[PDB]
Amino acid sequence: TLPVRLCKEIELFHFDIGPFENMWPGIFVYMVHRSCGTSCFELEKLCRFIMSVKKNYRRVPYHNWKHAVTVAHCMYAILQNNHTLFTDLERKGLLIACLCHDLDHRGFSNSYLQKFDHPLAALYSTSTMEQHHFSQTVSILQLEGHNIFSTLSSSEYEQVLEIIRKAIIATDLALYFGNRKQLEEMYQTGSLNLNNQSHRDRVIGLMMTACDLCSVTKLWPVTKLTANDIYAEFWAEGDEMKKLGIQPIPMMDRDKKDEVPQGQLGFYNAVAIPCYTTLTQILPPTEPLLKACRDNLSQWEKVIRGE
Amino acid sequence: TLPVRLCKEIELFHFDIGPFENMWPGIFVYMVHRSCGTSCFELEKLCRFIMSVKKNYRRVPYHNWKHAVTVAHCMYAILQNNHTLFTDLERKGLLIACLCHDLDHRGFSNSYLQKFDHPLAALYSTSTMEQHHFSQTVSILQLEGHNIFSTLSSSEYEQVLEIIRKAIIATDLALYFGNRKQLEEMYQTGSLNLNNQSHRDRVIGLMMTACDLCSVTKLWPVTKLTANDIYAEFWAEGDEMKKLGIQPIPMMDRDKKDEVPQGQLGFYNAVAIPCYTTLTQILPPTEPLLKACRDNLSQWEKVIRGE
Amino acid sequence: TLPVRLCKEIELFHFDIGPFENMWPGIFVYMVHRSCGTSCFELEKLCRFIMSVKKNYRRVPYHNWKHAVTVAHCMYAILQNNHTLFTDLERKGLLIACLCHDLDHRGFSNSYLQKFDHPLAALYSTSTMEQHHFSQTVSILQLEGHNIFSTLSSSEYEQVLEIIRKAIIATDLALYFGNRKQLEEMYQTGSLNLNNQSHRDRVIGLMMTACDLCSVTKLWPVTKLTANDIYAEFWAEGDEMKKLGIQPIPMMDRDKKDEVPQGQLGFYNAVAIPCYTTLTQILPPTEPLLKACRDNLSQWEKVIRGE
Ligand SMILES: COc1nc2cccnc2n1[C@H]1C[C@H](Nc2nc3ccccc3s2)C1
Ligand SMILES: COc1nc2cccnc2n1[C@H]1C[C@H](Nc2nc3ccccc3s2)C1
Ligand SMILES: COc1nc2cccnc2n1[C@H]1C[C@H](Nc2nc3ccccc3s2)C1
Ligand SMILES: [Zn+2]
Ligand SMILES: [Zn+2]
Ligand SMILES: [Zn+2]
Ligand SMILES: [Zn+2]
Ligand SMILES: [Zn+2]
Ligand SMILES: [Zn+2]
After folding, report:
1. Count of CB atoms within 10 A of residue B171's CB?
2. CA–CA gap between residue C256 and residue C238 (Å, rounded)
3. What is the dihedral sign for C-alpha A290, A295, A301, A304?
4. Residue A163 contacts by C-beta under 8 Å, 6 or more apart in sequence?
5. How far apart are CA C101 and CA A82, in angstroms?
6. Cα dist. C46→A40, C65, C144 in Å?
7. What is the rounded CA–CA span in Å between residue C20 and residue C27?
8. Is the dihedral of CA C236, C237, C238, C241 positive or negative?
9. Contacts of residue B256, Cβ cutoff 8 Å, sequence gap at least 6
10. Based on the number of CB atoms within 10 Å of its own CB, is C75 exposed (0-12), middle (13-18) or buried (19 or more)?
11. Cα(B171)–Cα(B298) distance, rounded to whole angstroms?
């Protein structure tokens, strides 16, 4: 258990995990215990696993340890408000997947790695960083005393690793557009069926996108401050693009700061609002994420106007 | 001994310890040896103690290792210019107290810890961080080979730990206002008596405030640059307050930068000038701190005007 | 071998080593193998040496590990395009010298160390930091399993250490002006002779300056961004000068930012263009460095105008 205020507010979708890093591991363990149960993991193994995962996130402005636990919390909130839908293994796997989904991130996009000709791009032609995140996850699990899935049968172990793999790959935003489009069609026609594994994998994929982007679903003061972190990374990549003799897209171009308000508008309209609209259609109890997304859209519109 | 320039200028109240971190331990050892004597501490134990204290200060903009040694230097200057007043134990304890007085500081105020519902606030209802600083000090002393007070009698050990405890607690600025007010009254009436232990504890408390705030007693270029560090911390806390859904006070509000000159004025008038005025009354050789404080007040007045 | 793009573009003088730190060691090993040969160093010893050198560079804005490898690359490009001129030992020694030439740099100039009265200034009256860089190099070589020159004869070992010493000392820009002037005279009169050791030492000295300053020979986007790093250091030193009660020169004065374009002009005209002009005269295949320097001069002239 946690302090009184945290216990209460952790159940809210728009919860912020706070600036005290050494409380984040305990926040995660709390979430796991309420989501899966106190006997889902051996506590000693789990804590060892969490600290090794922490050590393999880098000190970058956005794709860091705080992001990992923040993404995990959003998944916790989704799971707790749709608690009859998911199995034991899925709850286990998804929280872990979220915690590990950006492991060893450098603060650079897949396209930058390709243009730089980074060895990872030679190894992984598609979803380069995401395949690397999964590879890192697996490597940590293979460390002595780190296999938190020790007590599972081989059959169950293979299932949860596949849940984790698919989920981490789904955080490649390039795959989200096609996935969301398919889910929309299946929802409208009544074809969508959570008993169908391929349909289920898609819904989980959308859940992963929703959690990954959850910065846009916090209250305005948090959403606005987090934007500074995201652009710190993007502008750094844009600097590196210019060093390769390539003009970066405006989003990554430090010199085009004034276009931020309009750029944000475009993203909410093109990416965020559709993501949470579709997720809310499929899983109605995720409605608060959509409301908060809409509220942040209203705030960016006011910045553009000058209010 | 130190380089020629340092030897000379370390005796000045407005000395700056410089940007070379690995010289700060030697600066402290120099001060201890001149203040208490070369046989006050076993050198090997003292160096081990200093390095563990350094390791338990965090990389924050202001409440860091540099602040700790800077505070210790101000106490050194007070002690050397009032050298007949204090006992062996008090000189020992006060330098150590100053070095440890912000141990494990996160860069957040007591009020923020309370509002966040941080576990330390549940443990320590009053002077939350200061009670924690003392707890940290004690923990370091209990480490193998770290008890720098090994050679003291039990009686003396208990006295110096109490000197340290009271001194560290006195750095809670919330307790300064009441303390200064009492000292003022006792000074005016002739009641004040350094042979009275409770009166003595108050004077030491004021000395601790004076050392803690000594940023405002450096020369203008140092005082102005240090302000950047202090606001880096304050504005970060104000950001966190906004993330809890609480509007921070203007001092901690990044958006109210233009109010800095006037805010500083208010602090010098309400806090700093009274502190050093009262200290100078009680201990006349601390006069240079008051003069330099007044000079910085004049500089902030010129910023407001535009000069 | 390296990724395809790196293999190709590493041969260009204006190559940028990129933002992936863990590739820099492999970039260096690649350069050594192509420059000297695959049997010049025992690979295990070399990698151990490289990692210890990395550990002894500090996290400062400019005089860091990236600068060290960048300087080494420029020397690689000079060596590969003048491949018949230099001996086995010289190629070995110069790459190593470049990698170690700023070892343990604090981000402060020799003059600041003198004014602060830093112990290094008492030890080394001339070329203070450069003598320290060499001392650090030697200390690393003396570590167990770190003597990468193990297989050399004593005679050869002494020669390469002297090559390294002279080369590192030559990176003291204060010595460059006199050296360049002498080389100019010897070139014009036909006196200059690479078979004369003292003349040869001078030419190597100029090569070291050219590599050290090679920031001004990159493409404009790299050159412009690197300027931010250099001023971060300079302005920090200027801050420290003000803390000693000394007005810093405008270059190190944060308050005189607007003078950057004109200040840069002056440096290109007074230092950079003459350096690469003289180097190109002596070693014609280094011409691309001069062209790129001239192009950056044109860019700074356009900043001044407003284009
Ligand atoms: C893919 O872009 C983003 N991913 C995000 C994840 C969390 C929060 N925001 C995210 N964003 C973008 C950043 C903004 N989009 C743009 N900003 C600019 C700025 C300047 C010029 C063009 C653009 S597009 C939303
Ligand atoms: C408690 O405030 C401070 N503690 C200090 C310790 C050392 C040096 N300065 C200290 N200060 C304050 C910072 C300033 N006071 C204020 N600044 C502002 C800025 C904006 C709006 C209101 C205020 S009050 C003196
Ligand atoms: C010695 O100065 C420099 N060393 C450099 C090495 C690499 C790249 N640039 C270097 N520079 C200087 C920085 C600039 N010179 C000046 N800048 C200013 C700025 C303000 C006022 C005076 C000056 S001189 C070239
Ligand atoms: Zn990702
Ligand atoms: Zn992510
Ligand atoms: Zn404090
Ligand atoms: Zn303090
Ligand atoms: Zn140097
Ligand atoms: Zn250098």
Report:
1. 23
2. 11
3. negative
4. A89, A90, A93, A94, A97, A204
5. 61
6. 47, 16, 12
7. 11
8. positive
9. B250
10. buried
11. 26
**How crowded is residue C207: how many other Cβ atoms within 10 Å of its Cβ?**
24
Whether residue A199 contacts residue A275, with contact meaning beta carbons closer than 8 Å, is answered with: no
Is 1.10.240.10 the CATH classification of the domain at C1-307? no
Of the candidates B137, B136, B144, the residue with the CA atom closest to the CA atom of residue B48: B144
**C271 — contact with chain A (CB < 8 Å)?**
no
Which residues are within 8 A (CB) of A102 and not within 5 positions of it... i.e. 6 or more apart?
A57, A63, A67, A68, A71, A129, A133, A171
Q: Which tokens belong to A214?
A: 């959850």
Instruction: Please indicate whether residue C251, judged by its CB atom, sits closer than 6 Å to ligand 3.
Output: yes
Extents of the domains making up chain B = 1-307
Q: How would you label A73-84 residue by residue, b for 16+ Cβ within 10 Å and e otherwise?
A: bbbbbbbebeee
Determine the Cα–Cα distance for residues A83 and A245; give it in Å rounded to an integer. 51
Q: Which two tokens stand for residue C49?
A: 């040496």
Instruction: Return the active site residues of A.
Output: 63
Dist. CA B123–CA C1, nearest whole Å: 58
CA dist., res. B219 & res. B267, Å (int):
17
Residues C67/C53, Cβ–Cβ less than 8 Å: no
Of B117, B236, B242, the CB nearest to A5: B117
Contact criterion met (CB below 8 Å) for A115 and C6: no
* Method used to solve the structure: X-ray
- Cα distance between residue B89 and residue B156, in whole Å: 8
Q: What SS3 state is found at A84?
A: coil
Can you tell me the distance from the alpha carbon of A153 to that of A151, in angstroms, rounded to the nearest whole number? 7
* Structure-derived torsion over alpha carbons of residues B23, B24, B27, B29, reported in degrees to the nearest 10: -110
Q: Are the C-beta atoms of C66 and C24 separated by less than 8 Å?
A: yes
- In angstroms, rounded to a whole number, what is the distance separating the alpha carbons of residues A109 and B289? 54
A267 C-beta closer than 6 A to ligand 1: yes
CA distance B199 to C49: 61
CA end-to-end span of chain B, whole Å? 42
User: CA B305, CA B301: separation in Å to the nearest integer?
Assistant: 6
Query: Which residues lie closer than 8 Å to B283 by C-beta, 6 or more apart?
Result: B78, B82, B85, B203, B207
C-beta of residue A167 within 8 angstroms of C-beta of residue A94: yes
Closest CA to A42 of A51, A34, A33: A33
Give residue A306's region: left, alpha or beta (phi > 0; psi -120 to 50). left
Whole-angstrom distance, CA of residue C58 vs CA of residue B21: 13
**How many helices and strands (H and E) does chain B possess?**
15, 0
Indicate the length of chain C as a whole number. Answer: 307
Phi, psi of C72 (to 5 degrees): -60, -40
Is C295 part of any known ligand binding site?
Answer: no
Residue with tokens 């410089």: B18
Mutate to test the pocket of ligand 1, among A224, A267, A296 (most ligand atoms within 8 A of CB): A267
d(C-alpha A211, C-alpha B294), whole Å: 54
Interface test with A, best of C5, C30, C66, C295 (most A CBs within 10 A): C5
Give the experimental resolution in Å: 2.1
CB A176 within 8 A of CB A209: yes
What one-character-per-residue DSSP string does B116-148 give?
Answer: HT-HHHHH-SSSHHHHHHHHHHHHHHTSTT--T
In whole angstroms, what is the distance from residue B46 CA to residue C19 CA? 42
Tell if the CB–CB gap between C118 and B19 is shorter than 8 Å. Answer: no
The answer to whether C174 and C114 have CB atoms below 8 angstroms apart is no
- Contact by Cβ (8 Å): B99, B28: yes
